[PDB]
């Protein structure tokens, strides 16, 4: 109330209506979660193979708000509609609700545990498969971790309720995915080996990623015991004719069901999904309409009506989907400070191939410093840097490498020949040197070796799996250390999240000790505090509801503190808070 | 066999039964009307639930079906009526 | 002269038989009886589904000899695929907007429709690099008109129910906002 939410404008709290609750026509049916529950993952694969309709994976809970709302969508908004999604949309193959940037963002900016979100959503959604985006050797981090850390993360995530693991490598390197696929198989879950799509298979001028490359990668992934082949189009680069051709060639190559995931950045997501449906794709990633389009996934309702009278329908209850989309439309208004702005289809993504998260973060990093007025030159620098690196696959975290290299090159006014000739004197950004040192794995076609020698100077270059060169982690040692750092004995989920994000987890624990479970507040209250004379009710547990009313905000004293006159549970309570604006 | 008791009353008698239940080691469930939201007895129990939504507050405290519904969903083993509202009510 | 058929309803829905494929066929024959040069299909509310687009354009192309001009809106998010399905059926001209003023209640993007048909049997006749250069000017000058902008715009398949055109939707929203009825705009759409 007195200092504002960090990172956003300190605007007043708008009055908001309650979000519209769906009116659902419930139809009971056996979902894929049930088939995974009694029978195994192979019976789920058989269920997907024997389904003539195209199946849908809802990305509303993870990727739709990662793309549009900077991953800021809170558990409190998910909870009001999770049961409605589980019951009113039982035809969904899975719901993507975890992984990606959600793990970091929840802890860092939302001050809620991703594990707590997973537990609450799992309780609320018993008959819906839960899907996470697993980065293979990186898991949910950005660096690399030892093998037992990855296996323990998979074990804990599978135990806490993740059913489908979409496992991808940022450079499509199968060694950085084999162990994760095996661990997911061992834990009784579905492993989705993922091909990251880049380039243009129908463009002969770009033969590095052609149809044969994807076919060879596909049979290599089917050589592992992965249940479903995933095609990840992180930047929305897959054109509709290319989608039909690629999916047809993969269906000729492997026997695995194909799961296509694309973004609608160019405005061609629906037609690309339709072309893949003609080619025989099994599952496609869609978002709810109110969180679809732009950098997000194509709309689920739109893809129903796109395929309504064709040879293959979309397996969804579209009236229930529209009813749920009313709620999503209402709760999107809570996240106005995190909106990107006016959006439109942009086919320039076919040129620079920047994924939407990389687009937003590069825009933020370019406008935060004063050189953002040449963002077109920045995107051209991104394209030429990608070409200079040897046309690499640009997804998390290798998209960050290209972005930081381009940002450095126009920040300090470099050129391709500048780096290629006199690049031995500049201090290169640390993500670029870590990528060229082999910390992210081995690219397709190898590094630009002499250029690699320009980037790396007197640092060790490794050429194998970086997980082999990782310092061992002992879980009892880490658990005892964490029990020292935090005031209690941690769970396995706390230990594993402390391993990946040590300072982020400790900062989250400090914020938990200071402010408590802020995840229980509603989003306007979470972001804006309270107005004068406002009454809010915070349900802290079952049967306990705090009645909080702000009666008066005191003037700041000489020490910079304000006294806030609250009425907690009928009783007056005076809270002293330091106003950061007055500064003592 | 009793582990949780609901009080179908308000005011000081609800607090009295809550104190007796805490001394006897039982869990406490309060009920309250909307117009009684700032009552002390609501915040003296382990669980509190709104009853008689839309009714007059006296009629809300006489909502028999709502009181048994709250007691059943809260897992209360027993109901103490206190006095003055439904203590002498046969129904 | 572009004689124009305003499309409404759903030709592939048997429960709404008044605006069926035969009605559009006889109307197209009546329009070709006049000396109109091009037959136009006006989908003012974005109601033309892609399968319906293919069926309608095929049945019109085997009925009349006039070139077909399709105009649709993208309010349901299905404008590009509807245009592609009509392109398969043999539509001649399609109405597109520049990318910075496309999507939502407006027309599908011309750059997007180029890349949708890039390697198919029928291409889009446009210089897409030039159009992408024009679009930079168009977004830059779109920033001038912030007070006239609508809010957050997402695809909305509820237009298949109420069948409001985009201008009618905005004017009904303005009427529901000027007078005290905006909290039941869903009831307004059902009305
Ligand atoms: Mg299938
Ligand atoms: Mn994605
Ligand atoms: Mn129009």
Residue numbers in the entry:
A (entry chain B): 472 to 1055
B (entry chain D): 0 to 90
C (entry chain C): 662 to 852
What does the paper behind this entry write?
Pyruvate carboxylase (PC) is a tetrameric enzyme that contains two active sites per subunit that catalyze two consecutive reactions. A mobile domain with an attached prosthetic biotin links both reactions, an initial biotin carboxylation and the subsequent carboxyl transfer to pyruvate substrate to produce oxaloacetate. In this work, we study the structure of Lactococcus lactis PC (LlPC) during catalysis in the presence of positive allosteric regulator acetyl-CoA.
This resolution should allow the identification of side chains, the substrates and products of the reactions, and even ions and water molecules. However, there are large differences in resolution throughout the protein as observed in local resolution estimates. In all the cryoEM maps for LlPC analyzed in this work, the subunits have a symmetrical organization without major differences in their overall architecture. LlPC has a specific activity of 127 min−1 which is slightly increased in the presence of the allosteric regulator acetyl-CoA to 154 min−1.
